[PDB]
């Protein structure tokens, strides 16, 4: 299961089980480029969020109901959607994943 292995490999579920996580299958530079695309408000109202002009390939990882540490279990769902990221710093790069429409 891609989700169980990647979450483990990336030090996400090595010391706990994280409910949900999203992996973007695009190039680093192509994702960083989103910080200068469509500006939109973040869920918290903040306006340093940006939406991708086009959809991107993603894999949504969600914990099943039988998941319990130390044996986390995820459900894998692939799809293509716009990603919304919050940007900060210089260079203006993504620091938070806000959502995917």
């Amino acid at each position: 299961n891609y989700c169980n292995q990647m979450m483990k490999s990336r030090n996400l579920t090595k010391d706990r089980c994280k409910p949900v996580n999203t992996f973007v299958h695009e190039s680093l530079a192509d994702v960083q480029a989103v910080c200068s695309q469509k500006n939109v408000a973040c869920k918290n109202g903040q306006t340093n969020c940006y939406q991708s002009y086009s959809t991107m390939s993603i894999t949504d990882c969600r914990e099943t109901g039988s998941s319990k540490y130390p044996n986390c279990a995820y459900k894998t769902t692939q799809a293509n959607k716009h990603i919304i990221v919050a940007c900060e710093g210089n260079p203006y790069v993504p620091v938070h994943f806000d959502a995917s429409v």
């Binding site: 990336r10 996400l12 992996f23 695009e26 190039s27 900060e88």
Partner: peptide, 15 residues
């Protein structure tokens, strides 16, 4: 240790 920009890539990027 790890920056917010680095954390983001490690947690969500799989190019």
């Amino acid at each position: 240790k790890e920056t917010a920009a680095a954390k983001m890539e490690r947690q969500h990027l799989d190019s």
